[PDB]
């Protein structure tokens, strides 16, 4: 019964980025790797991540005005931001620490590279473990499963 190749055992925390901008995140424990992963996502996609986290907070209308208002009403009416606070508290301790670390990774990227963050999304920082949970909750339950379109009767193309 042939065993898989020996697992690699990281002795320091580092991202080795390849030539296509793929991060290989090595962490000495789970929280370290989640932090590295958050740093990497902020480097590669930070502006849109911050915007989306802002919206999952229910603060789209407040941060960016009328274009974001209908989403704000959809999410506040469905209690998404508060439910994400509840879900965050309801996490297992070990997994909550991974979420906290992923958020700290984003914040740390932005703190150390503030030139890379677009002005309009700076007001979103800092982000929290709960922001992460909230965006996932919006995506799964209130984009994929329950869309504003099917409830409000705006029924037309796939997007």
């Amino acid at each position: 019964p042939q065993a898989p190749i020996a697992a690699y055992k990281p002795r320091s925390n580092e991202i080795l980025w390849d030539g296509y901008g793929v991060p290989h995140i090595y962490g000495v424990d789970a929280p370290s790797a989640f932090y590295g992963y958050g740093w990497a996502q902020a480097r590669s996609h930070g502006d849109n991540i911050l915007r989306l986290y802002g919206e999952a907070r229910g603060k789209g209308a407040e941060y960016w005005g009328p274009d974001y208002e209908q989403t704000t009403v959809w999410l506040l009416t469905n209690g998404v931001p508060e439910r994400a606070q509840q879900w965050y508290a309801q996490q297992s301790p070990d997994f909550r620490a991974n979420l906290d670390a992923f958020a700290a990774g984003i914040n740390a990227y932005a703190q150390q590279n503030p030139d890379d963050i677009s002005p309009d999304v700076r007001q979103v920082l800092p982000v929290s473990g709960a922001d992460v949970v909230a965006h996932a909750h919006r995506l799964m339950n209130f984009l994929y499963v329950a869309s504003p379109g099917r409830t409000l009767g705006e029924g037309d193309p796939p997007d």
Binding site: Y20, A30, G36, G58, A61, M140, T151
Partner: protein
């Protein structure tokens, strides 16, 4: 989306194969995929996930891998309320709403905010919305009490065994998606996953519409466990697949039928021509290698042309208009592949838009209807060839209007353009039978169109020891202003030139172009 898992017995080397192949918008921000690799002393995961998610949904490692497709799991119900006396009618009595006074800030054009009031009303079903036409609708979403979505994915993708994977999946914290699994021990699995309400009556279409909101008859409270849902493990056919088709041909021969499950779980509608090709490409091929698996994934057949051109062509050649006759001969000489050099493909699409609707899913035009008894060879034929030829007449005019001619090369109109990279397109619309998908936009004024949706993250993994994997990301690994990593993969996509995915430390160390030391202190 497409997904394939192949058992060892169906391969030449004796190691399972997996295809990750989600199709989503190339522009919608929350649908953007990101590729990454995480390594600690205790786990390793490689793959893609939507930006902002802290766990990889399309993951694999040295032991196992998964992929996902959209299954449209009906996890919410929209209820039509009957309003009466400031409440709503429910079991023959008027019942008052729960109401809460909330508020939010709205940014004004001059940088300040105003406080805006927002009443949140709820019925026993859930939160209440008013549509533009006045319909009062309460939405009831299942699985609001399932906080463990991210952790479930994380435990699934780091599972030490199939048993550990299934116990994680069985928590029912991931509310939707088909999910396919493969590993180095040889197991493969398909699960029609999600959180589905237990109901006593009604098929899927009833529960997709506005359900009456005036009765506890339709007020569900419980949901299905994993073993109530369509699943397949190590089937006799030696593979599983899903290309967004209803879950009734996930393998061949099948292991269940629609009567084995409640009728509200999934539709019993005709499977798309792409989904039919998916079943054929796996079932008809044996002794598969990774290289062959990758070649089959590039399939771009105009299956719809196979089903219609035999009747359409002779009918069109009867027509006295010489442009229709010439169109007919152009279509007849076509090899029915969506290649860059095809002179007939664009014209064929424009005909199909009329014959099968703008989404190409219409069924009324065919002579022989779709049947689950012949799931990969129906529907077939042209019901009314004279009408179809009239459709061809219009489509000829449409093709010239859009593209300048009836015989412009497919890859001259169909382009993949990111920043200053501009390469020829190939493959096309799933509903026409193309397995590899590029949902081409409407053309601009010069007849040039680009993909709005389609191939995004594409990976193919053999669970050898060590594993061997290849992949591409159509729109690169970054979208930040000024990045060199947005347009740097699309040329490789145009040639199907896949990157070797690098999991072993030594491979990563040879490829490194940037090193970021970091440190975390809570």
């Amino acid at each position: 989306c497409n997904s394939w898992a192949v058992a060892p017995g169906k391969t030449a080397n004796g190691n399972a194969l997996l295809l990750q192949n989600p199709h989503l918008s190339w522009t919608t921000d929350y649908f953007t995929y990101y590729e990454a690799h995480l390594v600690t002393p205790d786990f390793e995961i490689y793959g893609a996930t939507q930006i902002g998610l802290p766990v990889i949904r399309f993951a694999f490692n040295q032991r196992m891998g998964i992929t996902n497709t959209v299954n449209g799991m009906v996890g919410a119900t929209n209820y039509r309320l009957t309003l009466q006396d400031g409440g709503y009618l429910y079991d023959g009595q008027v019942r008052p709403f729960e109401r809460r006074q909330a508020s939010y800030r709205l940014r004004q054009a001059d940088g300040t905010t105003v406080d805006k009031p927002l009443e949140i009303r709820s019925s026993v079903h859930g939160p209440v919305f008013e549509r533009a036409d006045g319909t009062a609708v309460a939405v009831r979403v299942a699985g609001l009490d399932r906080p463990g979505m991210l952790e479930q994915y994380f435990d699934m993708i780091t599972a030490d065994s199939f048993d550990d994977y299934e116990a994680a999946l069985a928590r029912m914290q991931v509310p939707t998606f088909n999910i396919v699994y493969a590993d180095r021990e040889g197991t493969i699995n398909y699960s029609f996953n999600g959180v589905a309400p237990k109901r006593a009556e009604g098929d899927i279409a009833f529960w997709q519409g506005l359900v009456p909101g005036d009765s506890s008859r339709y007020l569900w409270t419980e949901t299905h466990p994993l073993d109530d849902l369509p699943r397949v493990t190590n089937p006799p056919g030696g593979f599983v697949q899903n290309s967004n088709d209803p879950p009734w041909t996930p393998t061949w021969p099948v292991t269940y039928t629609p009567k084995d499950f409640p009728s509200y779980l999934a539709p019993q509608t005709p499977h798309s021509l792409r989904a039919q090709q998916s079943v054929r490409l796996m079932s008809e091929n044996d002794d598969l290698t990774l290289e062959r698996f990758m070649a089959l994934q590039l399939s771009h057949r105009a299956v719809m042309a196979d089903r219609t051109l035999p009747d359409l062509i002779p009918a069109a050649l009867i027509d006295p208009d010489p442009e229709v006759q010439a169109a007919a001969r152009l279509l007849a000489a076509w090899d029915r592949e969506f290649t860059s050099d095809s002179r007939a493909a664009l014209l064929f699409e424009e005909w199909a838009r009329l014959f099968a609707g703008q989404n190409f899913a219409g069924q009324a035009g065919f002579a022989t209807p779709w049947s689950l008894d012949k799931p990969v060879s129906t529907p077939y034929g042209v019901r009314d060839p004279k009408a179809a030829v009239d459709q061809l007449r219009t489509a000829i005019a449409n093709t010239k209007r859009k593209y300048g001619a009836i015989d412009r090369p497919f890859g001259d109109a169909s382009r993949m353009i990111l920043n200053d990279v501009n390469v020829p397109g190939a493959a096309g619309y799933g509903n026409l039978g193309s397995f590899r998908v590029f949902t081409w936009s409407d053309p601009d004024e010069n007849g040039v169109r680009t993909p709005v949706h389609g191939e995004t993250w594409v990976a193919m993994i053999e669970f050898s020891t060590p594993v061997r994997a290849y992949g591409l990301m159509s729109y690169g690994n970054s979208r930040q202003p000024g990045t060199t990593h947005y347009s740097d993969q699309i040329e490789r996509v145009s040639r199907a030139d896949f990157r070797e995915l690098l999991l072993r430390r030594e491979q990563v160390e040879a490829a490194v172009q940037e090193r970021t030391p970091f440190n975390f202190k809570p």
